[PDB]
Write an enzyme that holds these catalytic residues in place. Structure first.
Site, PDB file in Angstrom:
ATOM      1  N   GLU A   1       0.802  -0.922  -0.325  1.00 51.03           N
ATOM      2  CA  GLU A   1      -0.276  -0.175  -0.083  1.00 51.03           C
ATOM      3  C   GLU A   1       1.018   1.276  -0.134  1.00 51.03           C
ATOM      4  O   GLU A   1       1.311   1.918   0.765  1.00 51.03           O
ATOM      5  CB  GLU A   1      -0.947  -0.223   1.309  1.00 51.03           C
ATOM      6  CG  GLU A   1      -2.278   0.933   0.614  1.00 51.03           C
ATOM      7  CD  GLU A   1      -1.877   2.439   0.728  1.00 51.03           C
ATOM      8  OE1 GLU A   1      -1.352   2.966   0.153  1.00 51.03           O
ATOM      9  OE2 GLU A   1      -2.235   2.899   2.113  1.00 51.03           O
TER      10      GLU A   1
ATOM     11  N   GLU B   1       3.249   8.562  -5.218  1.00 49.41           N
ATOM     12  CA  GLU B   1       4.150   8.103  -4.148  1.00 49.41           C
ATOM     13  C   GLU B   1       5.378   7.220  -4.762  1.00 49.41           C
ATOM     14  O   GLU B   1       6.463   6.765  -3.432  1.00 49.41           O
ATOM     15  CB  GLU B   1       3.683   7.440  -2.330  1.00 49.41           C
ATOM     16  CG  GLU B   1       2.890   8.126  -2.148  1.00 49.41           C
ATOM     17  CD  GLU B   1       2.380   7.543  -0.535  1.00 49.41           C
ATOM     18  OE1 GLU B   1       0.992   8.358  -0.446  1.00 49.41           O
ATOM     19  OE2 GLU B   1       2.652   6.469  -0.528  1.00 49.41           O
TER      20      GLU B   1
HETATM   21  N1  LIG Z   1       9.932   1.660  -2.139  1.00 49.22           N
HETATM   22  C1  LIG Z   1       9.571   1.487  -0.288  1.00 49.22           C
HETATM   23  N2  LIG Z   1      10.628   0.847  -0.117  1.00 49.22           N
HETATM   24  C2  LIG Z   1      10.517   1.142   1.315  1.00 49.22           C
HETATM   25  N3  LIG Z   1       9.586   1.796   1.712  1.00 49.22           N
HETATM   26  C3  LIG Z   1       8.687   2.537   1.287  1.00 49.22           C
HETATM   27  C4  LIG Z   1       8.723   2.858   0.308  1.00 49.22           C
HETATM   28  N4  LIG Z   1       7.603   3.111  -0.901  1.00 49.22           N
HETATM   29  C5  LIG Z   1       7.322   3.974   0.388  1.00 49.22           C
HETATM   30  N5  LIG Z   1       7.871   3.532   1.180  1.00 49.22           N
HETATM   31  C6  LIG Z   1       6.983   3.666   3.722  1.00 49.22           C
HETATM   32  O1  LIG Z   1       6.190   3.316   2.649  1.00 49.22           O
HETATM   33  C7  LIG Z   1       4.424   3.886   3.897  1.00 49.22           C
HETATM   34  C8  LIG Z   1       3.109   3.855   2.702  1.00 49.22           C
HETATM   35  S1  LIG Z   1       2.596   3.848   3.938  1.00 49.22           S
HETATM   36  C9  LIG Z   1       1.250   2.256   4.299  1.00 49.22           C
HETATM   37  C10 LIG Z   1       1.876   2.152   5.427  1.00 49.22           C
HETATM   38  C11 LIG Z   1       1.342   0.220   5.736  1.00 49.22           C
HETATM   39  N6  LIG Z   1       1.608  -0.809   4.822  1.00 49.22           N
HETATM   40  C12 LIG Z   1      -0.032   0.551   5.798  1.00 49.22           C
HETATM   41  O2  LIG Z   1      -0.603  -0.262   5.350  1.00 49.22           O
HETATM   42  O3  LIG Z   1      -0.442   1.067   6.309  1.00 49.22           O
HETATM   43  C13 LIG Z   1       5.346   4.359   4.390  1.00 49.22           C
HETATM   44  O4  LIG Z   1       5.761   4.591   5.456  1.00 49.22           O
HETATM   45  C14 LIG Z   1       6.438   5.003   3.212  1.00 49.22           C
HETATM   46  O5  LIG Z   1       8.255   5.824   4.204  1.00 49.22           O
END
Ligand SMILES: Nc1ncnc2c1ncn2[C@@H]1O[C@H](CSCC[C@H](N)C(=O)O)[C@@H](O)[C@H]1O
Length: 641
Positions: free
Chosen positions: A137, A146
């Protein structure tokens, strides 16, 4: 590292961080992503996608084991979900360290400690078993802003087995073309005499940054769809060769009505497992019949075509749908397919809501009547920063001096003067260069610099400098201002701030802990929000908080007030009002219905305080408010009675 202290006014316990830790904490204070975790639908849809793909992979590959990768694990929720419901192994990445430790922490103290392991790198920086399933997500309202495309694309090449499955597997982005006076007003360059062909600033696409808005809270009468939703883009998250950063498509559809396309509304849906049965669908309330759920961390968006496009009933029309890696934009046939930026100059200074605000005032006969009344045959001076008020005053005034310290607005105002050939307006930079005593000062007041939308109080200092020069008798309007709060029961808004607790039977309370410590350390106590976009019912009268009479002198001002009806409310909105001559301008609440539904100004954001959790159940809350002659800032603290 959070440093405990005690609010000396409300007795509550708070934290602080050392300067070197500030940025880290601010980020971590935004790691909740509003209601993200409390979006029970988004959760039940990731789970379901996880069940299916974990099962089908169990079945398929010979050693009946299954290795799931969780990109952007956040609190680990998604890994906990993968482990439970079957994953023999779950490796889970997170670029942001403090969220790495959070996810290891919570993920250690768990029935699934064995199966889950947390690595604090970005997916795109890593080299290691290969993954059988990827779950991520990693979407925003634009779907792709993002990093999702690169994230899946690269994970697929380096980090996952061939025939990988991914959750979500698939998505669409939809546009709907609508005619809407409202939406136009968010993007339209202010036309001083009202006619269609006025272009005092030339032409412009307006701002390219996303315009995310809760279209569910838009009133049916405010827009008219011209066609059924059009598929702009299809994404396939399971096949790297299908993921492409820069793309364009001409899309076709049949208009079911004639009208002009004032805007294109967009949202996305995702197919959680490629079965066509289980979707997250961001379609708004009025066009989303089987998978609608309020949420805020995702929302819909509005886009504008660079030129006017008209559409005809039963006639086919085309829209060119473009994206680069991070942004979506739309354009007309035979027209430049490149992403456009404001070239007009105004788009890039003013927010969307302020641009609405200026079109609103320009069109408001009632407000224009008081300006005419107050200006007639007089020398008026205007103060503000980016405030167009002077140009209304000009209709009736002998002479208007617009005072604006910002060079970019003066150039904008000079262009208005030139285009409409206004013969009675000069512009100066500094308040002290007004050397001919005006008959009146008029302000809104609006300063684009205001740190907070409820605070355009630089007006009060500008007034004093003009009184020093020209006498305390100088007539000014507005003549009085007042800050106001009101207890409100929001339908859902409050989920952006309230504790997260236990979700899908997982104990996230550790994250509430660090999230709250981070938030007390970095956030303002009073959030800001476009309250027209959030539904609720007001639970008492608006109450007065600070008042700012204009006949001087400027003075610090203190208020301590009890706010009642909190046992059934869940937020307290704040805004400002002003007596501009004989009328009342509200930057917030405009009216309340018989049934208690409030209406809000779209041309400003308003303050809202969400009761901290120690205060979630109190019947009244004590609100300490403070205006400081020395900074011009207003500070708030909220406590028990
Ligand atoms: N390519 C990547 N590798 C690792 N972390 C990532 C990423 N792209 C985004 N993020 C991290 O991914 C998160 C997205 S928010 C979603 C967080 C959680 N999985 C949930 O579903 O509630 C953020 O914490 C951001 O820092």
């Amino acid at each position: 590292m959070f440093l405990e202290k005690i609010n000396q006014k409300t007795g509550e316990r708070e934290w602080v961080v050392a300067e070197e830790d500030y940025d880290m904490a601010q980020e971590l204070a935004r790691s909740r992503f509003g209601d993200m975790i409390l979006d029970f639908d988004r959760n039940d849809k990731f789970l379901a996608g996880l069940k299916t793909t974990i099962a089908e992979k169990k079945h398929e590959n010979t050693d009946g084991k299954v290795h799931v990768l969780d990109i952007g694990t956040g609190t680990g929720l998604l890994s906990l979900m993968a482990a439970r419901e079957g994953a023999d192994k779950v490796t889970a990445l997170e670029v942001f360290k403090p969220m790495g430790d959070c996810a290891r922490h919570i993920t250690s103290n768990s029935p699934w400690s064995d199966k889950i392991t947390v690595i604090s790198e970005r997916s795109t920086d890593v080299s290691q078993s290969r993954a059988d399933i990827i779950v991520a997500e990693v979407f925003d309202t634009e779907l792709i802003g993002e990093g999702a495309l690169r994230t899946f694309k690269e994970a697929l090449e380096r980090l996952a087995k061939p025939g990988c499955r991914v959750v979500p597997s698939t998505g669409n982005v939809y546009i709907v073309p609508v005619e809407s006076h409202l939406l136009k007003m968010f993007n339209d360059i202010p036309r001083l005499n009202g006619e269609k062909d006025e272009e005092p600033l030339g032409r412009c696409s307006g701002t390219a940054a996303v315009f995310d808005v809760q279209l569910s809270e838009m009133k049916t009468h405010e827009f008219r769809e011209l066609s059924e939703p059009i598929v702009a883009f299809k994404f396939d998250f399971e096949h790297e060769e299908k993921i492409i950063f820069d793309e364009s498509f001409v899309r076709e559809a049949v208009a079911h009505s004639s009208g002009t396309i004032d805007a294109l509304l967009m949202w996305w849906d995702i197919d959680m497992d490629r079965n066509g049965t289980t979707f997250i669908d961001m379609g708004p309330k009025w066009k989303n019949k089987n998978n609608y759920a309020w949420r805020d961390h995702w929302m819909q968006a509005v886009y504008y075509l660079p030129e006017k496009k008209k559409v005809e009933m039963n006639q086919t029309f085309e829209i060119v749908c473009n994206h680069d890696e991070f942004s979506l934009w739309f354009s007309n046939v035979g027209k430049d397919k490149s992403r456009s930026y404001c070239v007009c100059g105004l788009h890039s200074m003013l927010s969307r809501q302020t641009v609405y605000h200026v079109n609103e005032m320009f069109e408001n006969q009632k407000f224009k009547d008081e300006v005419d009344k107050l200006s007639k045959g007089l020398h008026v001076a205007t103060v503000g920063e980016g405030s167009f008020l002077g140009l209304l005053a000009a209709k009736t005034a002998k002479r208007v001096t617009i005072i604006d310290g910002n060079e970019r607005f003066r150039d904008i105002f000079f262009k208005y003067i030139h285009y409409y050939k206004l013969t009675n307006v000069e512009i100066i930079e500094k308040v002290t260069s007004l050397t001919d005593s005006p008959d009146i000062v008029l302000a809104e007041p609006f300063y684009m610099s205001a740190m907070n939308p409820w605070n355009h109080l630089r007006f009060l200092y500008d007034v004093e400098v003009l009184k020093m020069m020209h006498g305390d008798e100088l007539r000014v309007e507005p003549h009085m201002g007042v800050l106001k709060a009101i207890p409100e029961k929001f339908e859902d808004l409050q989920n952006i701030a309230s504790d997260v607790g236990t979700v899908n039977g997982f104990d996230l309370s550790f994250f509430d802990e660090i999230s709250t410590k981070a938030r007390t350390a970095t956030d303002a106590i009073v959030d800001e929000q476009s309250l027209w976009e959030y539904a609720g019912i007001v639970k008492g009268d608006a109450v007065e908080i600070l008042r700012f009479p204009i006949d001087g002198r400027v003075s610090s001002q203190k208020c301590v007030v009890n706010i009642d009806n909190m046992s059934s409310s869940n937020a307290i909105p704040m805004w400002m009002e002003w007596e501009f001559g004989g009328i009342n301008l509200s930057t917030g609440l405009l009216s309340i219905s018989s049934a208690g539904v409030p209406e809000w100004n779209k041309g400003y954001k308003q303050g809202v305080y969400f009761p901290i959790t120690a205060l979630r159940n109190d019947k009244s809350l004590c609100l300490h408010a403070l205006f400081d002659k020395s900074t011009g800032d207003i500070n708030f603290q909220f406590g028990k009675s």
